[model samples]
Target chain A: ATLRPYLSAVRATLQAALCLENFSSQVVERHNKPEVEVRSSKELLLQPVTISRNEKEKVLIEGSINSVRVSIAVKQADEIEKILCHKFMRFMMMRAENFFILRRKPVEGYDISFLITNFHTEQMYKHKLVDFVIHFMEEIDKEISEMKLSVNARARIVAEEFLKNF
Target chain B: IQAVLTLYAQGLGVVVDSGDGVTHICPVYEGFSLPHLTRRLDIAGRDITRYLIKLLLLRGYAFNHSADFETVRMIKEKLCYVGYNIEQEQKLALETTVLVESYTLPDGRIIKVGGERFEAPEALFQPHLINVEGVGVAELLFNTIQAADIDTRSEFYKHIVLSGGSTMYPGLPSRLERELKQLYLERVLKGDVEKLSKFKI
Candidate 1:
């Protein structure tokens, strides 16, 4: 789809949303940090359960009817997955406002792989599913801040590879 | 506890990750790693698909319609192919359509958009269908609320009570009242509970 219209709507909505000052610029930066400073926290892990293949390379994962998981090791693939996971990750993306003030600058790139992963984990365990959602709606002032953050967090060097050359 | 655990262990059937720090588990065949579509649309680009979906909702379509479903998945797959891998995110946004898109088309265009059904200005309660994007607007809201399991009725309802820009919308109060009532009903009535009395049981 041509991004011009969609991007414009997003920008307009965000500009309207930002009029309120409650959304501090800081949430963007301090999104994720060590919980207890335990060295073991850095590794990637998930709850294992039934697994199936979607096609050849992609896999279908179902832990519960409510929860579905998909894993991809490729950096670009994972980055795209983060974007695809937007609604789910949206709760976390709003965190950009929290970190933005504390940190010196917003994380940068066209894809937001690093920051999303960081924030998603917090969103997962920090709040119950329903409660997390109520906060999500009120918490996000500008949809575009997170959108821009997402593009920025994704590694631009390789992200360009995914973009149309036009 | 044992029964539930057994059910889940049987349900999951595979471990996606098992290590000292964290053990990841998921369904075996459900995970896929395709060559990122390489034609990327940032799946996380702030409700882009929803924006498309909203356009469709205004036109009047329902959930489970092939057009709406396919558009969502099409966008998801293409976005994934492009390397955004927004598989899960797309799903949530797509779900929002279900609730938000529940309105029927107007008796005519002006009544529909103007919302004269209620008392004063005739506001909008349900979102319209989106022939363009092929999804219903209110359905998206329903879908999002369902997926997120948030208190759908009150979130948007309470905010409009005091407003400048918002009150300008035609059916805001009625829609808000309807949604809040629904929420009250849903919460008051849960599994195995006794039937509720209109006043007080």
Candidate 2:
């Protein structure tokens, strides 16, 4: 399948989902938490959606009254690719504060997640944040493919040398 | 008036009507001049809403009264921000690039917003500019803290906090910081007060 439509669909959905407002918690007086996470109230949370390019590539956006959680499942073709993706995501998630929108843990069935709250929107431009997430998705694919090619090249060189010795 | 009523009900202040439309509820029984210190601003969230409603009406956007008032509140919350440099912002407001933007109403009516966009939030800093009573927000903050204990004045200057939804506007923190700094400098130059020289916000 062509990647353009898939990406465009994700971008459009994300733009809509990013329309967040500063909502005070009615459930807990004087307390405000992301309704998507707490699930304390039924009305505040929007319908959860999954936009997939294929079986291995998909994005889930769950929006709430005060926040939005974006979960992405990057394509991992094999065992080595899976390991590389895990390590890369783990490294990024461990230093989540630096990234600002990064979630400490990926949601179920996804490789990485970003939790953007209303407070984040207040501090920065909302469309810029959306653009950033779209950029990240684009780069992650290119990054893994480059790593895979390098790994294959090294493996081929190591095998040739070993066979020559034999 | 409500506070005055409460005071009169509790037998605290004598309600005196001087026939000039400015009713004075003097707290004679209390025997202290401290009531002026506790005087709250007539300019606040509700006042901002009222101002927005009037501005929108004057601009020729017609709507039902109560519902449109809530919409005005939402618009204020979404678009309003304190200008870091009011002079620079006012200059920019003249250029077409900075002044105009589209605001979509709840019913999908898109209206073109211009100078009134900045003017509404400007009321927070300059209440008199909008023909409202009481000093601006930054001045009120300084005066309220100054009324407190003498020793705690420096500490108050150090940790200036803006509470509530109205203070959440973008650039407000910096704007207030600048305003308070100017106020501090003016006081220092005068050198009339003891702790005025040490003050910063």
Candidate 3:
């Protein structure tokens, strides 16, 4: 009940943030260094918005005239869940440049960032960016718990060997 | 020298220090350190400064002359923080301005800081951001401790204290605690294939 509806709301919120246009910077007349890149003029960005599925799942969507930054708060790593996600993301985030949406480092209290500028949306064009994040959420959520079982199962056999020898 | 502090406090901790130019991780037990186990990490305040400089420029800040570099370091000192629950914090910052701060420059301009504060320092944990090859501090800590005597494993895990000014970012302690645990847990399911293969034969 909680999972499906919450994700549905995230899909809606993300689409709104994706409402962007190619806008140049006011501070630098010579270049379009992008809006989020340069915040000189007043009223350059829309109100920043965030949604959370309790503390475990969070989504922060920062929108501007030309760019939208979608930052995700991953699964809280209390035990196995935390470790699996941490390792998984560290693997992926390290190659962040390869991915279209990921920020190489996380925000502050979060694990990964999906920084979307006009270069991405306008470059190839798609609602696919939103699809990637939403899909990433479901997969990450599913796989972490799946691997937790694998890890615990492993410890049982490994611990037995040492115990028998002692 | 800094490694002494770890033994003085206690444990065979993997002592890590990343200051202005120096960075290292060493094993200390009780009052002694293992020189052979000591390793160097390339994550220093310089890389952090450059990383932060790179981040600010992405924001289209006008960087020029001598004072700009100084201002960047001041901003790093004033605003940057190491993340604990890193990704979660990043999202919160995007949604709210809680972590964002306004720093006053000598030029009387205001820099409304945001995620770059913590993200720059974060390169220490993942040095890949700066493009400086293998061994970020977190993994370096893991390898140093793992190579240590198994008898002191618990003690080593207990005292992962950070030293040096660059390592002094906010929430550094808890972040290390989180990463250290993740290292152990990630190893669990993998089941040591090579070692296990040897055992089977």
List, for all models, the DockQ compared with the true complex.
0.01, 0.02, 0.02
Model 1 alpha-carbon miss at residue B176, Å: 1.7
lDDT per residue (tens digit) for residues B1-201 in model 3: 668764565433667777889788877766777798889987799778878888887876766535577878888987887766566657545533434567887989877677788799989888788998876787778778778888776677666777778887866765665566567657644453333211000
Task: Encode model 1's per-residue lDDT on B3-89: one tens digit a residue.
Answer: 224224444211122121211222122222112110111112113334334434554533244445444433322221110112322
Tens digits of per-residue lDDT for model 2 on B107-165? Answer: 88898655566577677778886687776767766666666665655655654433345
Order the candidate numbers by lDDT, best to worst.
3, 2, 1
Off by over 4 Å in 2: A160-166, B1-201
Q: Enumerate residue pairs that collide in model 2.
A: none
TM-score per model over all chains: 0.16, 0.45, 0.51
lDDT of 1 by residue, A1-166 (tens): 4333433343343222212111111111211122111112223222332221222222112121122122221112355444544543445444433432111111222112111222333345422322432233333324535565676677685568677474
Docking band of candidate 1: incorrect
Between candidates 1 and 2, name the one with more favorable TM-score.
Answer: 2
Cα deviation at B25, candidate 3, in Å, is 0.6
Q: Which parts of model 1 are misplaced by more than 4 Å?
A: A1-166, B1-124, B129-167, B183-201
Worst 10 residues of 2 chain A by lDDT: A25-34
Q: After best superposition, candidate 1 residue B201: deviation in angstroms?
A: 27
* Candidate number of the best TM-score: 3
Model 2, residue A105: distance off in Å is: 1.1
Q: How much is the lDDT of residue B193 in candidate 3?
A: 39
Model 2 quality (TM-score):
0.45
